[PDB]
């Protein structure tokens, strides 16, 4: 699967670059990823999708804390690859429109409690996982 291997190589490089960043930078990058996925979930924010997400959330809660941390890092690396690929397809003005939407979701995030923010991040991770498994079935 040339597509699957190329994607896994892109995720690997982003993981390696993410690990070399400071604790402070890692946090900012993680929050940007949450905010971007939130921008992408706006469309349906009020099927099947929420049933698929909820299944995945329930699956994630049976895992160890250490496995959920590794999953979280992979998700972040994957969204960084998708965000980079998305930006290549935008004009300068579309890129600035997207940054405005991301920043607005980031400010929205800051107003939440730690407990609500933890729930939002887990849901963002579940959605990303469902998308990627729904995606991996069309790569070769
Ligand atoms: Na550090
Ligand atoms: Na998965």
Author numbering: 4 to 49, 57 to 150
Article, verbatim:
Deeply knotted proteins, whose topologies may introduce substantial barriers to folding, thus represent an interesting test case for protein design. Here we report our attempts to design proteins with trefoil and pentafoil knotted topologies. We extended previously described algorithms for tandem repeat protein design in order to construct deeply knotted backbones and matching designed repeat sequences (N = 3 repeats for the trefoil and N = 5 for the pentafoil). We developed an approach for designing tandem repeat proteins that fold into a class of knotted topologies known as torus knots.
While kcTRP3c.1 and 3c.2 remained recalcitrant to crystallization, crystals of kcTRP3d.1, 3d.2, and 3d.3 grew readily, and their structures were solved via molecular replacement. kcTRP3d.1 and 3d.3 were phased with the original designed atomic coordinates of kcTRP3d as a molecular probe. The crystal structures of kcTRP3d.1–3 validated the accuracies of the designed molecular models and their intended deeply knotted topologies. Superposition of the structures to the original designed atomic coordinates of kcTRP3d produced all-atom rmsd values of 1.84 Å (kcTRP3d.1), 1.43 Å (kcTRP3d.2), and 1.90 Å (kcTRP3d.3). The structure of kcTRP3d.3 displays 120° rotational averaging in the crystal lattice, such that the positions between the repeating subunits contain a mixture of both peptide loops and protein termini. However, the conformations of secondary structure are unambiguous in electron density. The thermodynamic stabilities of kcTRP3d.1, kcTRP3d.2, and kcTRP3d.3 were studied under equilibrium conditions using the chemical denaturant guanidinium chloride (GdmCl) and unfolding was monitored using both the intrinsic fluorescence and far-UV CD signal of the protein to probe both tertiary and secondary structure. All three constructs show similar stabilities and the stability of kcTRP3d.3 did not change significantly between 25 and 10 °C. Collectively, these data establish that all three constructs unfold and populate an intermediate state, in which a considerable amount, if not all, of the α-helical structure has been lost but in which there remains some burial of the tryptophan side chain(s) suggesting that hydrophobic interactions play a role in stabilizing the intermediate state. As with many knotted proteins, apart from MJ0366 which is both small and has a very shallow knot, the refolding kinetics of kcTRP3d.3 are complex. In contrast to UCH-L1, for kcTRP3d.3 we also have evidence from the interrupted unfolding experiments that the denatured state initially populated on unfolding (which we term D*), undergoes a conformational change over time (with a half-life of ~200–350 ms), which we hypothesize is associated with untying of the knot to the denatured state observed in equilibrium conditions (D).
